[PDB]
Structure 1
Amino acid sequence: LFPPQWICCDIRYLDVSILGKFAVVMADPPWDIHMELPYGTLTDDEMRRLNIPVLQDDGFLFLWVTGRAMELGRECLNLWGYERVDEIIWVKTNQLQRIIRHWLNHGKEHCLVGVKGNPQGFNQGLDCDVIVAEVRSTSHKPDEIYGMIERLSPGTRKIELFGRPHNVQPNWITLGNQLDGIHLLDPDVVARFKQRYPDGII
């Protein structure tokens, strides 16, 4: 039940095949949503081209989507070899359990759930598809998703794409370009890393 692992990298260019197969993939990409944004985004094409299909044979993808990414994320999810089988929504609250206030004020964020191949020994139907939790930062997903994923697939290995530092968790490998260097302990991964990247230069 490995402690947290991560790789600061550009996920467009990393050879993800070194990392092996995962029961669960979660991605919270900075989609191009056709609005000016504080942070950098990936184009539609770089999102479609991500080498997601190498990361799993059998299991679930959790894909955070906003705005036109509700449609683009569904495209990407099908291009990558997944069927969308669930959609979680996170109801954003304050500390008093009140909803935080376009044709419409947005009270929620959407996570698409994809299935690939024949997942076996998952505990389906333990949690429900609604998360109610406080917004603690701008641009952070709630920590409860890690709990729901753990109960769904206890002690399996998982990978998060575009995760931030607070998102490093046991049983998870976190990728993104705001993490602090490379911290890898799974010796399978350590060996395939050293072999592919003898000078550590991603």
Structure 2
Amino acid sequence: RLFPPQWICCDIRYLDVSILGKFAVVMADPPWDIYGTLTDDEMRRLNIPVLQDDGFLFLWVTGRAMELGRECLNLWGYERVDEIIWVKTNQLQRIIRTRTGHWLNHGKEHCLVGVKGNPQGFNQGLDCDVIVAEVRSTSHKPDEIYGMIERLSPGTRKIELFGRPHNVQPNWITLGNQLDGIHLLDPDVVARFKQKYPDGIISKP
């Protein structure tokens, strides 16, 4: 095992993620173009490929990002092997019904699961692919997903992209532009960060 939460406030377009090393799991909840958003090209160009050799990607999608996210996942070198749905509930366990141009109410959000390489020793098949969890503030994804990921891959290092302060977790490094400064504790990451960013400034390259 257990390493405390770590994070980097950054513009994820500009950070050289190669300094962070390799991760068993990547999770992202991108600000799809459907504060601020990323354009479809900015999403495609994210250097996700450097983050893992063998392991899993969890990618939240809605609307047209069901298709754009599939494209991104494939472009980044993953194959989609599962798809989690979060059934959104209130405090009494009833479905919350929510978009113009749709003639169906939506009761869920989707999280694509991609695989890269051939992961070994993950506990596949412990959890199922439906999360039932209460909705909290706008865009706040359920904490259940961290538990499912920890049971799948206990004690390994993980990275979350586009996380907010409430997303930081033990064994995770969180990146996002709403985080408070830079909190790094892994000596290897600390050393490579200092070498790359001696004055702590992660500006547009």
Interval containing the TM-score (normalised by the shorter chain):
over 0.9
Please state how far the C-alpha of 1:103 moved relative to its aligned partner. Answer: 1.4
Question: 2:71 matched to 1:75?
Answer: yes
Aligned partners of 1:200 and 1:15: how far apart in 2? 13
Residue 152 (structure 1) aligns with = 152
Question: 2:61 matched to 1:65?
Answer: yes
Unaligned runs of 5+ residues in structure 1 are 34-38
Aligned partners of 1:167 and 1:23: how far apart in 2? 18
Aligned partners of 2:136 and 2:70: how far apart in 1? 28
What secondary structure, in the 3-state scheme, does the structure 2 residue paired with 1:86 have?
Answer: strand
Residue 36 (structure 1) aligns with = none
Aligned partners of 1:79 and 1:138: how far apart in 2? 29
Aligned length: 196
Please state how far the C-alpha of 1:49 moved relative to its aligned partner. Answer: 0.1
Aligned partners of 2:157 and 2:90: how far apart in 1? 33
**Structure 1-normalised TM-score?**
0.96
Please state how far the C-alpha of 1:146 moved relative to its aligned partner. Answer: 0.3
What secondary structure, in the 3-state scheme, does the structure 2 residue paired with 1:57 have?
Answer: coil
Please state how far the C-alpha of 1:126 moved relative to its aligned partner. Answer: 0.3
Aligned partners of 2:32 and 2:89: how far apart in 1? 24
User: Which piece of structure 1 moves more, 132-141 or 167-176?
Assistant: 132-141
Residue 130 (structure 1) aligns with = 130
Q: Percent identity?
A: 99
Consecutive aligned runs of 4 or more in structure 1 exceeding 6 Å deviation: none
Unaligned runs of 5+ residues in structure 2 are 97-101
Over the aligned positions, Cα root-mean-square deviation in angstroms equals 0.5
Please state how far the C-alpha of 1:148 moved relative to its aligned partner. Answer: 0.2
Please state how far the C-alpha of 1:10 moved relative to its aligned partner. Answer: 0.5
Aligned partners of 1:139 and 1:74: how far apart in 2? 20
Please state how far the C-alpha of 1:145 moved relative to its aligned partner. Answer: 0.3
Per-residue displacement from partner, 1:28-76 (whole Å, max 9, x unpaired)?
Answer: 001001xxxxx51100000000000000000000000001000000000
Aligned partners of 1:144 and 1:50: how far apart in 2? 26
